[PDB]
Design a protein around this ligand. Structure first.
Ligand SMILES: N[C@@H](CCC(=O)O)C(=O)O
Ligand SMILES: [Zn+2]
Ligand SMILES: [Zn+2]
Length: 258
């Protein structure tokens, strides 16, 4: 009866409260998705339990075993009843799980250390001094793996063979790499996360160029779940009322430190 929510520790969507050790259950977390989960649950009339995805991944299907990992996997195999996180709506995922209409719009973008002589994806593709990569088991990596677009095709050709690996396990790892590489590493990540980090000390990174694509994050449920319909209506109601915009301002800019 209590709905099991799978989510991921990704700032500012879900973060551990400073005093989480003295708190219980859902109260241990804070963030955009924590606030949204409470609202979705309230509007859909269900009790829930926030759980962090075991493998800390978003969701990809292994080409060899064909098994789904990450939050998608937890939904596919029945470990969670719903995923409320910055989970990108994609065709391959839509084929195995259901997604609500987008609660956030975004696109792949470029994050550089301030001062890096890069202004676009084309710029990155035409040079070799500056390395660049993406997150693992995510929609961004898949975007490049599948792109038939010349520029992105070139970029994938480079990234998949670059040594040492230009891929990272978590967004935080990618951000740290940019900050410590003296401008020799640029990170490809969704505009949402890029924009957030841009407003965080040490204020040494910035988003450059236009988004490479346009898509959205959706609340996901197991294929054919009974919660799907209500969850989708709730997302639309909250967006139409202005809550989603308020929540983004709250976690991105209201407490911006740059
Ligand atoms: N939002 C992405 C993860 C982040 C990324 O791939 O850049 C996903 O659902 O896979
Ligand atoms: Zn802790
Ligand atoms: Zn409400």
């Amino acid at each position: 009866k209590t709905v099991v929510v799978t989510t991921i520790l990704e700032s500012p969507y879900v973060m551990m409260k400073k005093n989480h050790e003295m708190l219980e259950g859902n109260e241990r977390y804070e963030g955009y998705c924590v606030d949204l989960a409470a609202e979705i649950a309230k509007h859909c009339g269900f009790k829930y339990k926030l759980t962090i995805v075991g493998d800390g991944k978003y969701g990809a299907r292994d080409a060899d075993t064909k098994i789904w990992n990450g939050m998608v996997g937890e939904l596919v195999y029945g470990k969670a009843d719903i995923a409320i996180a910055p989970l990108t709506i994609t065709l391959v995922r839509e084929e195995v799980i259901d997604f609500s209409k987008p609660f956030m719009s975004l696109g792949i973008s470029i994050m550089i250390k301030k001062g890096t002589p890069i202004e676009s994806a084309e710029d990155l593709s035409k040079q070799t001094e500056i390395a660049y990569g993406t997150l693992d088991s995510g929609s961004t990596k898949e975007f490049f793996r599948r792109s038939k677009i010349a520029v992105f095709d070139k970029m994938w050709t480079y990234m998949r063979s670059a040594e040492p690996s230009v891929f990272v396990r978590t967004t935080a790892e990618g951000v740290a790499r940019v900050r410590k590489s003296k401008g020799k590493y640029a990170y490809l990540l969704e505009s949402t996360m890029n924009e957030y980090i841009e407003q965080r000390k040490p204020c040494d990174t910035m988003k450059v160029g236009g988004n490479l694509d346009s898509k959205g994050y959706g609340i996901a449920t197991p294929k054919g779940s009974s919660l799907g319909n209500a969850v989708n209506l709730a997302v639309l109601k909250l967006n139409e009322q202005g809550l989603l915009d308020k929540l983004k301002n709250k976690w991105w800019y209201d407490k911006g430190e740059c």
